[PDB]
Amino acid sequence: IVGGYTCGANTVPYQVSLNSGYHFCGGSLINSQWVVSAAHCYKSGIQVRLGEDNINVVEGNEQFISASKSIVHPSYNSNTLNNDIMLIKLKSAASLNSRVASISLPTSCASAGTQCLISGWGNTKSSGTSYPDVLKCLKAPILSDSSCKSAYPGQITSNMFCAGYLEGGKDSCQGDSGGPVVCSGKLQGIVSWGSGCAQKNKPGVYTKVCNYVSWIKQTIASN
Ligand SMILES: [Ca+2]
């Protein structure tokens, strides 16, 4: 997160870190046994780390649970990043309390104008590299489909939306990928892609979760 603020410990209780020896991606806890993340985050050997604030210190609210199964979206295309979404089942159920909690799925899509909370342990510099230890947060609006498409001609599908600021300076970044975009208490987006970070006229591009709720629910029901 570039141009954000320190969230505060365990204030984003659905935020997870994906670990394969180091933090490499975010995700969101959507029930006690399932995590939603970006398909471009897929790899084997994932450990899900819940209840984190400082990813480099054991602080006392962590739960570390191995993935038992990963499911990339059937239609994921790694070249276009269309359908950049994946489900991870945990080997055991997480224990849910105030500091570790699931996030609601949307029953309807969000619209342009709605403010959202984006969070992660990704890079904090736009023209630089500095990775935080503690979770960072940014409040940002959804942008119109037209300004999204004008920012990225020929690249925005119906499964993507833009959020952030056209002026630059505030955005998600490398290492935030897979993490949440939550609007009025609903998981509306997944950190997916963008040209650089926090650059002028190059807002964040997010997976449009509302398009996937049917796939998410049926997948959970059968696995
Ligand atoms: Ca920790």
Swiss-Prot record:
Keywords: Calcium, Digestion, Disulfide bond, Hydrolase, Metal-binding, Protease, Secreted, Serine protease, Signal, Zymogen
Ways its activity is controlled: Is inhibited by scorpion cyclotide trypsin inhibitor TopI1.
Keyword Hydrolase applies: yes
SUPFAM superfamilies: Trypsin-like serine proteases
Residues engaged in binding substrate: D171, S172, Q174, G175, S177
Active site: H40, D84, S177
EC number: 3.4.21.4
Keyword Signal: yes
Molecular-function GO terms, alphabetical: endopeptidase activity; metal ion binding; serine-type endopeptidase activity; serpin family protein binding
Top-level enzyme category: hydrolase
GO cellular component: extracellular space; serine protease inhibitor complex
Tissue and organ expression note: Synthesized in the acinar cells of the pancreas.
InterPro entries linked: Peptidase_S1_PA, Peptidase_S1_PA_chymotrypsin, Peptidase_S1A, Serine_Proteases_S1, Trypsin_dom, TRYPSIN_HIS, TRYPSIN_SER
Primary location class: secreted
Binding annotation for Ca(2+): E52, N54, V57, E62
Cofactor binding notes: Binds 1 Ca(2+) ion per subunit.
Peptidase S1 domain mapped to chain residues: 1-221
PROSITE patterns named among the record's database cross-references: TRYPSIN_DOM (PS50240), TRYPSIN_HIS (PS00134), TRYPSIN_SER (PS00135)
Post-translational modification as stated in the protein's UniProt record: Subsequent cleavage after Lys-125 leads to alpha-trypsin. Further cleavage after Lys-170 yields pseudotrypsin. A cleavage may also occur after Arg-99.
Disulfide-bond pairs as recorded: C7-C137, C25-C41, C109-C210, C116-C183, C148-C162, C173-C197
Record Pfam families: Trypsin
Reaction(s) the record says it catalyses: Preferential cleavage: Arg-|-Xaa, Lys-|-Xaa
Sequence similarity: Belongs to the peptidase S1 family.
Subunit structure and binding partners: Interacts with SERPINA1.
Protein name (database record): Serine protease 1
Species of origin: Bos taurus (Bovine)
Gene designation: PRSS1
